[PDB]
Design a protein around this motif. Structure first.
Motif, mmCIF file in Angstrom:
data_model
loop_
_atom_site.group_PDB
_atom_site.id
_atom_site.type_symbol
_atom_site.label_atom_id
_atom_site.label_comp_id
_atom_site.label_asym_id
_atom_site.label_seq_id
_atom_site.Cartn_x
_atom_site.Cartn_y
_atom_site.Cartn_z
ATOM 1 N N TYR A 118 -14.961 -6.611 -0.931
ATOM 2 C CA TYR A 118 -13.507 -6.837 -1.380
ATOM 3 C C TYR A 118 -12.909 -7.866 -0.520
ATOM 4 C CZ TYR A 118 -12.855 -2.997 -4.733
ATOM 5 O OH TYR A 118 -12.690 -2.167 -5.861
ATOM 6 N N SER A 119 -12.324 -8.527 -1.232
ATOM 7 C CA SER A 119 -11.454 -9.513 -0.539
ATOM 8 C C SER A 119 -9.910 -8.844 -0.569
ATOM 9 C CB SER A 119 -11.392 -10.933 -1.565
ATOM 10 O OG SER A 119 -10.865 -10.745 -2.754
ATOM 11 N N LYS A 120 -9.176 -9.267 0.554
ATOM 12 C CA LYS A 120 -7.872 -8.861 0.814
ATOM 13 C C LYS A 120 -7.059 -8.709 -0.465
ATOM 14 C CE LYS A 120 -4.427 -8.875 4.397
ATOM 15 N NZ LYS A 120 -3.232 -9.747 4.865
ATOM 16 N N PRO A 121 -6.626 -9.940 -1.173
ATOM 17 C CA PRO A 121 -5.949 -9.963 -2.328
ATOM 18 C C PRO A 121 -6.355 -8.840 -3.493
ATOM 19 C CG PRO A 121 -6.671 -12.177 -1.825
ATOM 20 C CD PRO A 121 -7.571 -11.426 -0.692
ATOM 21 N N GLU A 122 -7.692 -8.525 -3.418
ATOM 22 C CA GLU A 122 -8.074 -7.676 -4.424
ATOM 23 C C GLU A 122 -7.431 -6.009 -4.146
ATOM 24 O OE1 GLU A 122 -12.227 -8.960 -4.263
ATOM 25 O OE2 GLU A 122 -12.142 -8.243 -6.369
ATOM 26 N N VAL A 123 -7.606 -6.003 -2.693
ATOM 27 C CA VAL A 123 -7.165 -4.826 -2.143
ATOM 28 C C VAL A 123 -5.583 -4.886 -2.225
ATOM 29 C CG1 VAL A 123 -7.191 -3.272 -0.166
ATOM 30 C CG2 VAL A 123 -9.160 -4.712 -0.422
ATOM 31 N N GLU A 124 -4.995 -5.820 -2.039
ATOM 32 C CA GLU A 124 -3.447 -5.898 -2.141
ATOM 33 C C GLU A 124 -2.925 -5.886 -3.469
ATOM 34 O OE1 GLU A 124 -2.966 -9.985 0.064
ATOM 35 O OE2 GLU A 124 -2.251 -8.948 1.450
ATOM 36 N N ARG A 125 -3.514 -6.192 -4.804
ATOM 37 C CA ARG A 125 -2.669 -5.977 -5.896
ATOM 38 C C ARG A 125 -2.613 -4.686 -6.275
ATOM 39 N NH1 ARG A 125 -6.962 -9.786 -8.635
ATOM 40 N NH2 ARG A 125 -7.725 -8.039 -9.721
ATOM 41 N N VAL A 126 -3.981 -3.722 -6.202
ATOM 42 C CA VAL A 126 -4.024 -2.646 -6.807
ATOM 43 C C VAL A 126 -3.189 -1.539 -5.971
ATOM 44 C CG1 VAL A 126 -6.040 -2.057 -5.535
ATOM 45 C CG2 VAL A 126 -5.867 -1.001 -7.663
ATOM 46 N N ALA A 127 -3.135 -1.870 -4.756
ATOM 47 C CA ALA A 127 -2.367 -0.922 -3.828
ATOM 48 C C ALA A 127 -0.869 -1.165 -4.188
ATOM 49 C CB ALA A 127 -2.609 -1.554 -2.408
ATOM 50 N N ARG A 128 -0.537 -2.240 -4.315
ATOM 51 C CA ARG A 128 0.950 -2.768 -5.022
ATOM 52 C C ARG A 128 1.293 -1.736 -6.131
ATOM 53 N NH1 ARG A 128 1.428 -7.589 -1.213
ATOM 54 N NH2 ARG A 128 3.177 -6.469 -0.751
ATOM 55 N N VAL A 129 0.293 -1.810 -7.048
ATOM 56 C CA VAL A 129 0.598 -1.072 -8.178
ATOM 57 C C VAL A 129 0.683 0.568 -8.037
ATOM 58 C CG1 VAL A 129 -1.019 -2.769 -9.507
ATOM 59 C CG2 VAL A 129 -1.259 -0.338 -9.694
ATOM 60 N N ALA A 130 0.016 0.952 -6.982
ATOM 61 C CA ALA A 130 -0.165 2.388 -6.440
ATOM 62 C C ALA A 130 1.257 2.929 -6.016
ATOM 63 C CB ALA A 130 -1.309 2.557 -5.437
ATOM 64 N N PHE A 131 1.712 1.787 -5.101
ATOM 65 C CA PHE A 131 3.059 2.172 -4.332
ATOM 66 C C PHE A 131 4.147 2.300 -5.524
ATOM 67 C CE2 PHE A 131 0.917 0.744 -0.564
ATOM 68 C CZ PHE A 131 1.215 1.950 0.324
ATOM 69 N N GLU A 132 4.340 1.259 -6.379
ATOM 70 C CA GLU A 132 5.472 0.998 -7.393
ATOM 71 C C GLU A 132 5.148 2.328 -8.067
ATOM 72 O OE1 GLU A 132 7.934 -0.969 -7.363
ATOM 73 O OE2 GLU A 132 6.996 -2.730 -6.423
ATOM 74 N N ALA A 133 3.875 2.712 -8.847
ATOM 75 C CA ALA A 133 3.767 3.909 -9.454
ATOM 76 C C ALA A 133 4.180 5.100 -8.684
ATOM 77 C CB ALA A 133 2.209 4.161 -9.825
ATOM 78 N N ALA A 134 3.960 5.328 -7.489
ATOM 79 C CA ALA A 134 4.570 6.480 -6.640
ATOM 80 C C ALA A 134 6.048 6.412 -6.642
ATOM 81 C CB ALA A 134 3.838 6.081 -5.190
ATOM 82 N N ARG A 135 6.614 5.270 -6.588
ATOM 83 C CA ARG A 135 8.163 5.175 -6.313
ATOM 84 C C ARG A 135 8.452 5.906 -7.696
ATOM 85 N NH1 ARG A 135 9.227 -0.966 -4.238
ATOM 86 N NH2 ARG A 135 10.014 -0.165 -2.077
ATOM 87 N N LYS A 136 7.786 5.930 -8.874
ATOM 88 C CA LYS A 136 8.340 6.672 -10.126
ATOM 89 C C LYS A 136 8.193 8.005 -10.141
ATOM 90 C CE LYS A 136 7.910 2.220 -12.590
ATOM 91 N NZ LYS A 136 6.802 1.451 -12.547
ATOM 92 N N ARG A 137 7.203 8.418 -9.228
ATOM 93 C CA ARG A 137 6.664 9.944 -9.408
ATOM 94 C C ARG A 137 7.357 10.688 -8.074
ATOM 95 N NH1 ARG A 137 2.168 11.032 -12.236
ATOM 96 N NH2 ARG A 137 1.551 11.973 -10.474
ATOM 97 N N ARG A 138 6.452 11.193 -7.111
ATOM 98 C CA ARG A 138 6.965 11.773 -5.922
ATOM 99 C C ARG A 138 6.553 11.121 -4.804
ATOM 100 N NH1 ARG A 138 2.771 14.433 -8.489
ATOM 101 N NH2 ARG A 138 2.560 16.377 -7.495
ATOM 102 N N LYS A 139 6.328 9.798 -4.640
ATOM 103 C CA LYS A 139 6.577 9.012 -3.571
ATOM 104 C C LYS A 139 5.627 9.364 -2.404
ATOM 105 C CE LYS A 139 11.174 8.094 -4.929
ATOM 106 N NZ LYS A 139 12.335 7.608 -4.300
ATOM 107 N N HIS A 140 4.279 9.652 -2.753
ATOM 108 C CA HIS A 140 3.102 9.954 -1.912
ATOM 109 C C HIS A 140 1.929 9.227 -2.513
ATOM 110 C CE1 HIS A 140 5.611 13.074 -0.540
ATOM 111 N NE2 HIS A 140 4.894 13.337 0.610
ATOM 112 N N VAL A 141 1.253 8.405 -1.701
ATOM 113 C CA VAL A 141 0.184 7.710 -2.053
ATOM 114 C C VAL A 141 -0.945 8.356 -0.903
ATOM 115 C CG1 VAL A 141 -1.179 5.602 -1.919
ATOM 116 C CG2 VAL A 141 1.404 5.614 -3.036
ATOM 117 N N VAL A 142 -2.147 8.658 -1.501
ATOM 118 C CA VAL A 142 -3.290 8.711 -0.793
ATOM 119 C C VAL A 142 -4.233 7.543 -1.188
ATOM 120 C CG1 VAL A 142 -5.378 10.188 -0.116
ATOM 121 C CG2 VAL A 142 -3.027 11.346 -0.812
ATOM 122 N N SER A 143 -4.664 6.920 -0.187
ATOM 123 C CA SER A 143 -5.528 5.806 -0.341
ATOM 124 C C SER A 143 -6.899 6.317 0.061
ATOM 125 C CB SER A 143 -5.269 4.658 0.410
ATOM 126 O OG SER A 143 -6.358 3.438 0.335
#
Lengths: 345, 345
Positions: A157-182
């Motif tokens: 994994y490259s940093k940018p790959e890890v960065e994108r998908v993490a950003r979508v998880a955080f934004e998704a969480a924002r719309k739900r209950r705001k907890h992310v488990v990586s």
């Protein structure tokens, strides 16, 4: 609100209109400015055009803001060179829009705990969104090979790959209950360590969302013992494949599940179930996954979280009062859809 | 029948004698020729000798036919350089005997379906043995590294690695219900393809055992939806880690679980639970996992399958009539052990 609708094959035309009926009803009530067009895709496009993703359709998803997709494929086309298989048309679609996160929610609707394989007390309140990295990791990593003597594959994994998908998880969480488990394997693997430190660093720009790290072996166990504790889970490609599939059995009926894919391009929202061609045109297909795909589109493609939730409640209620045949009921596609709309009012 | 007994730490001395009491009872009834000696190991050996695996103990497991091992470790020794941590003594032990398969069974004892996270109908009759490759795969594979930019790890298997652990699965199956499910990711990965073709070729020498192949994402789902369908499952290192942990939650009580490790050297049979030092010497420790470790030793170390099964039934019954405190009961270590022996007669 410009939606490209790709009905597909088998029961696709039926369940996708059931979702359009719901989108129109909201368009009318709320003035959403819904504009959509339906394009050929999958087996029907092969039959009509000679290929699964013809140029008008590619053009059409390019110009849209979201794609609502029915089911694709069927034995009719199982005998094709896979340069023009329905399956491959699905790949070109997600590839053409660079969609690098797969969103797969599992949810035990209240009163449907009986369907769960889990004890009722454990199944209750489960609502977990797995965010799966799609484009990277061991499924794609080099070097890879096979010998008379050995085989090898590289989880990379490259940093940018890890960065994108993490950003979508955080934004998704924002719309739900705001907890992310990586989820990683940071206690044994470099890649686990690198994933974890990267997601921890990304998380600093999202002060409003809680972040927690778990190993893949532990998250697997939590999903059976305490799956109601999760909100959003984000993880790499192979782990997210396992954990998506594991989480998907929790509700006890795969026909209920929607799916979204997000990226740089036009997002794709589709039911998890197949064409079920045997019942195409009988009017009995369960439209639940398609309607919940439309709710996913509202939430993730347009940010209309409160409406997505209004739609989700309408079907929670419809599932109880007019269960489709595959929940032991007698509601055909139209009768079920009508029950949803009743509660949309 | 020469057993090296390594009691360990915390509740280890208590539960390991509870198992010896059972082994002696069978020795007497059946004339097994039990001969055992107890050796220092773990925290107690550090305190006594300065290291966790001192030379008399290494010598002693070298000369024995099986090792019955209690629990190891505790906060007392958490502050040590790991060249002499209890954890590391555990590693040297399994390394010194070249034990390359980990055997972890999960079993819902009849009448204990209530403990399961699964609905009673699904939990009933579950009895699955996961065979985990221990020495290879991504946990150990090169190349591996980490960058500012990326990290990588290599899932790599040689034919001989795949061959050993498959042979122990087939031989284990022979003693149970003669069905083996090998788990891979053959539909995406070379390593999956190579594993599968190798296990299929190994299986030809075992005409009496049935062989079936599943993907890791599917086996994960089967373990929640239909786990009673499995007998022996064999898979690589990281998968077997996930699937072992997943299968271990099915019975609903981790204190009940035994574990074996097999290889070229002396086999090690141990409970999965820890030292639980807080209760060391109170006489309340649940000896179930230790007694079922002894049954595992009979079966796998000595081939005494019918006796292992006799012991397993004695504890199935004891668990119902004199449940230990952690199953809601009031049976201390001795009272429980006595109930087992009652049924051994």
């Amino acid at each position: 609100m410009k939606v490209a609708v790709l009905p597909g094959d088998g029961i696709g035309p039926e369940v996708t209109e059931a979702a359009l009926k719901v989108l129109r009803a909201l368009d009318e009530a709320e003035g959403l400015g819904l504009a959509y067009e339906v394009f050929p895709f999958g087996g029907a496009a092969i039959d009509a055009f000679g290929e699964p993703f013809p140029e008008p359709t590619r053009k059409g998803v390019e110009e849209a803001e979201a794609v609502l997709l029915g089911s694709v494929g069927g034995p009719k086309w199982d005998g094709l060179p896979r340069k023009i298989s329905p399956e491959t048309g699905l790949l070109s679609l997600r590839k053409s829009q660079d969609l690098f996160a797969n969103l797969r929610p599992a949810k035990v609707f209240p009163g449907l705990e009986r369907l769960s394989p889990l004890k009722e007390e454990i199944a209750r309140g489960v609502d977990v969104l797995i965010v799966r990295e799609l484009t990277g990791g061991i499924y794609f990593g080099e070097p890879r090979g096979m010998s008379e003597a050995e085989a090898w594959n590289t989880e990379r994994y490259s940093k940018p790959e890890v960065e994108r998908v993490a950003r979508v998880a955080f934004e998704a969480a924002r719309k739900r209950r705001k907890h992310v488990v990586s989820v990683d394997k940071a206690n044994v693997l470099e890649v686990g360590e690198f994933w974890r430190k990267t997601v921890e660093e990304v998380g600093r720009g999202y002060p409003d969302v809680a972040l927690e790290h778990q190993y893949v072996d532990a998250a697997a166990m939590h999903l059976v013992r305490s799956p109601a504790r999760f909100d959003v889970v984000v993880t790499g490609n192979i782990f997210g494949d396992i954990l998506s599939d594991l989480a998907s059995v929790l509700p006890g009926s795969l026909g209920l599940l929607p799916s979204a894919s997000l990226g740089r391009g036009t997002p794709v929202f589709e039911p998890v179930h197949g064409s079920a061609p045997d019942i195409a045109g009988k009017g009995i297909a369960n439209p639940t996954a398609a309607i919940l795909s439309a709710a996913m589109m509202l939430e993730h493609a347009f940010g209309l979280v409160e409406l997505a939730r209004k739609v989700e409640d309408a079907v929670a209620k419809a599932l109880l009062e007019t269960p489709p045949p595959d929940l032991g009921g007698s509601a055909g596609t139209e009768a079920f859809t009508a029950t949803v709309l009743r509660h949309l009012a």
